Design a protein around this ligand. Structure first.
Ligand SMILES: CC1=C(/C=C/C(C)=C/C=C/C(C)=C/CO)C(C)(C)CCC1
Length: 134
């Protein structure tokens, strides 16, 4: 079983601008955001997840239990309300965010000491990789 617990520092971030544009985040904001390093802080207790996404610009928090749908407010991103549901795919997390934007969600997994995060909206996909610090 994967263990997502820890602090993970971004190594790479590809096609983030494509996803931000699909979310209608304006160009000025995309330009700021694409150049920032991010940190992911995760506390996992079995199916219970507390996560934080940190940057010098804005921070983002999302907490969930596997299989339990909840209202997510993407404040600081696109600031939309979505119905979010995260489930397992083997050792991987797969999240669907039901709402105004079509085909919105993300997929997260570990290979070794690297955390991978795929973020998708409409036909766009962003791939991020993070290295475990603690
Ligand atoms: C666009 C946007 C940002 C991106 C955050 C992303 C999109 C987080 C994805 C969160 C998920 C998938 C949960 C943890 O895996 C941050 C807040 C850095 C700065 C302001 C603009």
């Amino acid at each position: 079983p994967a263990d997502f617990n820890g602090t993970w520092e971004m190594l790479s971030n590809d096609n983030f601008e494509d996803v931000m544009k699909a979310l209608d985040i304006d160009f000025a904001t995309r330009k700021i955001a694409v150049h920032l390093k991010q940190t992911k802080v995760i506390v996992q207790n079995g199916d219970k997840f507390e996560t934080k996404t940190l940057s010098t610009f804005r921070n983002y928090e999302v907490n969930f239990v596997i299989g339990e749908e909840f209202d997510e407010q993407t404040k600081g991103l696109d600031n939309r309300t979505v119905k979010t549901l995260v489930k397992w795919d083997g050792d991987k997390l797969v999240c669907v965010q039901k709402g105004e934007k079509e085909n919105r969600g993300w997929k997260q997994w570990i290979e070794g000491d690297l955390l991978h995060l795929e973020i998708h909206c409409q036909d766009k996909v962003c791939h991020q990789v993070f290295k475990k610090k603690n």
